[PDB]
Structures are given as structure tokens and as C-alpha cells.
């Protein structure tokens, strides 16, 4: 009735809903690690690097807790790209990389994917598709050593622009003048590092700021940096919700006969989705098998005739269908439709509430693969193999003929559609009006 948007239902078979076996529990699995990541040495280094020669550290083989960063009031920005920072304690990574330096406050504007300005062009470049977070804060109270702190340095020309994550150290003179400068200064021949005058009295845009940038290695290999999340025991051969290493979903987890090669960590379908995993705690190879599914064709006489009903669970086996009652999640779900007195395995799927019969009749409601159903005598929806017609051995012999001695003049009615309703639409009045 809710499929057809109607209170009356006429006789037939209707594709109402899609039964799926449901997640019984949530299963969580992560690598065997407890040792904390070195975030204090990242965020509280005594002096941060010069932005021409910025620091970069690989983080691996550890447990993080990004709340210790994200919920600290100590930061002037915490901007992230491709991840909402809330998710960082659930999600996890093969490695993380922390880049770090001091910069002028006006130039923090340049520290983003695809941003433009002298530092972004010549001495610190993020790729346009960066995944991760930029953390920066004012450091005028630490890094403004009276005024002449020209150890903090950057670029403006030299030769050519900078690639994403390209390190540089080089010391050849700027040749902005036409002359081959050959290590000697002149008009437009000059020293190849520009520098900052960090006085503690500077206006905020001219003040120093400390920077950390986190890039996250979401590659397909095993995870080694993960959040404070706790694993469960494994479940097999029953439908469950899951999370392995941050790969979430619902499935019947099982042992697998798939020969993964030693470096293969996951299996994938044509549709890009995962179908198999290696357990990070057990090292066993497991199918993330889809929980079994099938269209719920509901078979009915007219509601004009009876409100008794049968259900075909399409494709599924009568041994596998587990619903029984609304304790499994709502579609047919009324308290008999998986384990009743009459249940029958058609090749189209498990047929329940209909009563199998050894006769054959002309096909009333078609079910499929030679099976039909009808409402008959104390009434029930019977189900049977369809009759093709009455059987007849023609009385053939090499010298016998039958000749008709009489006739009948039949009148037969044949009905044909010839034309349909001539509609017209004003699309500006339909769309806008």
C-alpha cells in the first residue's frame, strides 16, 4: 500500500522493498600499537626553522591524539583540507609528515593549497590537492629578538618557482640585472635571501608566527599512525557493522580462500568497493562479504477479495532468510514470514505464506521459472507449476484422413490503440511561472 501510494491493491505481484540481513554488532580492528606520537617535539621545538630551509619530520609506528592539539586554545588557526578535524581520532594513516618553520604574520595567508605570494612561489609550496591541516600561531613573544633577527629568511626570484614539498638550500646570487653577476653585487646583482626584522614592537602583520603543517599519507599500505580508538574481538559468518583501520561499512565477515600476495592488504570489486581485508591484529585474510539481499515481491489476490498475502524473497534460499519478526529491521517483518508452516524453494527465490500444490493449472499470478500462484480453497494462496495446455495424440496413420462435416461462423473482437492525448507544455511556465 505504501509502495503503490494506494489503500486498495489489485491482484498481482509487487516489488515493494529490498530485504537485507542486518548488522548484529559493530566490529573494530586496528594495529597493535600504544606508544604515543612525538607531538610535543613537533609543536614545542625551542626554535622553529627558517622558512627558506624549513623542517620536515616523518611520524610513524605510534598512537596520536589530535584532541590535545585541536582543543588547545594555543593556536591562531587550525585549517584543514579533505578532512574535518573532528574525524582525526577515528581515521588513520600509513604515515603523517609534520613540516615546520617561523613566518611573518601577513604571509600565513600564503600557507594553503593553490595560494599565491612570494613564499608560496619560491620557498614553501603546498600541492593544489593537499590532504591535511595547517596550524599556525603568533610567536612575537618568542621569535622577535629585539629587532635584527634576520636569521628568518625567504625568497623572491633567483631563477624559477618552487614545486610542492621541494626542499632547497642553494646560495647562487640573484641575477635580476642583465650582467653575469659571478658572485659579485651591483645594480640588480644581489644576495639570494630576503630576511625579516622581527621587533617585538612590530605591527601584527609584520610579527613572527610559528607554523606546523600536517600532511596525511592515506595510501593503500598498512596503517602506522592511528587515533585513541579501541578494537573489539573479531566476528565471523554473521552480518555486522565494521571498521578496519578507518575503512567502515556493513558485511558478513568470513575466512577467505583468496590467495592474497604477501604485500596485498585489501581486495576490490569492479565497482571500486572493498570485498576483502587482512586483519591488522590476526594477520588472517577475510572477506567483507556483502550481507545477503533480495527484492521483496509481495503476492496478493485483490484486497477486493482477501487481505491474506504471500512473499517471494527473490534469489535468497529458504535456508538463509533470517527475518521471522520485527526484531530484524523493518520490511515484511510480521511475525511468521520466514519460518511458517508452508515455505517453498522456487528457483526464483524463497516463497513464504503460499501453499505448494502437486496439480497444474493455467497461470494466474506469474512468479517465475514455470511457477504461478492463485487464491483457492479455507482459502489460501496456492503455488504450482503452470499448465501449457491439454495433451493430444493426433490419430495419424499413412492412409487415414479426417474431414469436417459442418462449420461454425465465429465473430472475434480485436482491439487496437491508434492515437493518444495531444499534450502541450509551456516550459517557462512549468519551470518558472
Amino acid at each position: 500500500k505504501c509502495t503503490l501510494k494506494s489503500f486498495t491493491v489489485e491482484k498481482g505481484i509487487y516489488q515493494t522493498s529490498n530485504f537485507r540481513v542486518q548488522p548484529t554488532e559493530s566490529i573494530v580492528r586496528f594495529p597493535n600499537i600504544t606508544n604515543l606520537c612525538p607531538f610535543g617535539e613537533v609543536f614545542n621545538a625551542t626554535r622553529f626553522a627558517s622558512v627558506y630551509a624549513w623542517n620536515r619530520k616523518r611520524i610513524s609506528n605510534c598512537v596520536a591524539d589530535y584532541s590535545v592539539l585541536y582543543n588547545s586554545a594555543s593556536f591562531s588557526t587550525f585549517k584543514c583540507y579533505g578532512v574535518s578535524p573532528t574525524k582525526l581520532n577515528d581515521l588513520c594513516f600509513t604515515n603523517v609528515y609534520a613540516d615546520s618553520f617561523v613566518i611573518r604574520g601577513d604571509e600565513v595567508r600564503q600557507i594553503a593549497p593553490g595560494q599565491t605570494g612570494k613564499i608560496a612561489d619560491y620557498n614553501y609550496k603546498l600541492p593544489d590537492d593537499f590532504t591535511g591541516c595547517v596550524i599556525a600561531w603568533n610567536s612575537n613573544n618568542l621569535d622577535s629578538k629585539v629587532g635584527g633577527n634576520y636569521n628568518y629568511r625567504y625568497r623572491l626570484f633567483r631563477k624559477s618557482n618552487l614545486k610542492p614539498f621541494e626542499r632547497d638550500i642553494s646560495t647562487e646570487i640573484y641575477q635580476a640585472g642583465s650582467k653575469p653577476c659571478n658572485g659579485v653585487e651591483g645594480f640588480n646583482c644581489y644576495f639570494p635571501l630576503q630576511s625579516y626584522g622581527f621587533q617585538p614592537t612590530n605591527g601584527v602583520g609584520y610579527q613572527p608566527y610559528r607554523v606546523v603543517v600536517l600532511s596525511f599519507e592515506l595510501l593503500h599500505a598498512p596503517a602506522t599512525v592511528c587515533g585513541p580508538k579501541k578494537s573489539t574481538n573479531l566476528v565471523k559468518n554473521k552480518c555486522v557493522n565494521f571498521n578496519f583501520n578507518g575503512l567502515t561499512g556493513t558485511g558478513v565477515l568470513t575466512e577467505s580462500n583468496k590467495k592474497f600476495l604477501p604485500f596485498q592488504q585489501f581486495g576490490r570489486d569492479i565497482a571500486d568497493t572493498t570485498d576483502a581485508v587482512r586483519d591488522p591484529q590476526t594477520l588472517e585474510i577475510l572477506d567483507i562479504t556483502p550481507c545477503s539481499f533480495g527484492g521483496v515481491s509481495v503476492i496478493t489476490p485483490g484486497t477486493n477479495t482477501s487481505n491474506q498475502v504471500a512473499v517471494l524473497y527473490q534469489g535468497v534460499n529458504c535456508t538463509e532468510v533470517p527475518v521471522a519478526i520485527h526484531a530484524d529491521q523493518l520490511t515484511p517483518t510480521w511475525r511468521v514470514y520466514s519460518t511458517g508452516s508452508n515455505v517453498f524453494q522456487t528457483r526464483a527465490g524463497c516463497l513464504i505464506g503460499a501453499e505448494h500444490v502437486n496439480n497444474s493449472y493455467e497461470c494466474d499470478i506469474p512468479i517465475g521459472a514455470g511457477i504461478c500462484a492463485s487464491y483457492q480453497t479455507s482459502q489460501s494462496i496456492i503455488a504450482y507449476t503452470m499448465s501449457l495446455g491439454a495433451e493430444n495424440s493426433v490419430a495419424y496413420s499413412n492412409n487415414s484422413i479426417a474431414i469436417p462435416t459442418n462449420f461454425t461462423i465465429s465473430v472475434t473482437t480485436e482491439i487496437l490503440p491508434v492515437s493518444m492525448t495531444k499534450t502541450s507544455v509551456d516550459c517557462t511556465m512549468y519551470i518558472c511561472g
Partner: protein, 149 residues
């Protein structure tokens, strides 16, 4: 239910028009289904972001209807060409084509009009009351073989 072909041609075109009308109630991701809500709540630069989601969805909703009616018109036209052919061969003639103008050997047909269609009353000779006989392909007489004309 005998006129189920003609009544289904009424039902399909009513179901298609009612479906095209109901799609005016959909948001398609705008703040409202109603164009005058968007234009009364929002100022031009911010309103034109919402209105273009309704144009996107309503134009796709109408292209779906016209594509479906172009396919359905070709189904009706195939049946109109068959009805025009049964008019010529069954009514204006007598047909030798087996089961074309109804079951049995064709004698005659009469057209009747009906809403959106045509009905043919096909008149046919159907044989009745068989009897068995012995039979042979030819007769010998004076040593000649005789065959029936």
C-alpha cells in the same frame, strides 16, 4: 477488462501528467519547493544560487517526460500502422494471411470506433464435426493413374 489496451493508454498518459505535476513539490537541494519562498526570504545574489537548483531539477524532470512520450508515441505509431493495415487487408478485402484477421479462415471484418483506438469484428469460418475416412493419393483404372482435380 476486455478494453484493457485502450484503458491502459488513458492510464499511462494520466500517470505521466500526474508524475510531472508532483515533481513541482521536490526541493532538488534548494531551501524550498516554492519559488516565491526563495524570492521573498533571500536577496538577489543569494537567491539565484537556490533558484538554479530548481531550474536544474525541473528541466531534468521535464526532459524525462518528453523522452518518455517520444518513446511511447513510437509504440502507438507501430499500432496505428497495424490498424491501418488491418483496415486495408481485412475490411476493404479478404485476407489469405493466417491468423491476421482472427482465428479460422477469414470471411470478412467490420470496424467499430472506440476511445483512442479501433475495434475489428473479424468474421471467420471455423470447421466442425470431423469424421474419419480411408484415403489414397491416386486411383488405378485401365492401368492409368487418376488424381483428383
Amino acid at each position: 477488462s476486455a478494453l484493457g489496451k485502450l484503458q491502459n493508454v488513458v492510464n499511462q498518459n494520466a500517470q505521466a501528467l500526474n508524475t510531472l505535476v508532483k515533481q513541482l513539490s521536490s526541493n532538488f537541494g534548494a531551501i524550498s519547493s516554492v519559488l516565491n519562498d526563495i524570492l521573498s526570504r533571500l536577496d538577489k545574489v543569494e537567491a539565484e544560487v537556490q533558484i538554479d537548483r530548481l531550474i536544474t531539477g525541473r528541466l531534468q524532470s521535464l526532459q524525462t517526460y518528453v523522452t518518455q512520450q517520444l518513446i511511447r508515441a513510437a509504440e502507438i505509431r507501430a499500432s496505428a500502422n497495424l490498424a491501418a493495415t488491418k483496415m486495408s487487408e481485412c475490411v476493404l478485402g479478404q485476407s489469405k494471411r493466417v491468423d491476421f484477421c482472427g482465428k479460422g479462415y477469414h470471411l470478412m471484418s467490420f470496424p467499430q470506433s472506440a476511445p483512442h483506438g479501433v475495434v475489428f469484428l473479424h468474421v471467420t469460418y471455423v470447421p466442425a464435426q470431423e469424421k474419419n475416412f480411408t484415403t489414397a493419393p491416386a486411383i488405378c483404372h485401365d492401368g492409368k493413374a487418376h488424381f483428383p482435380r
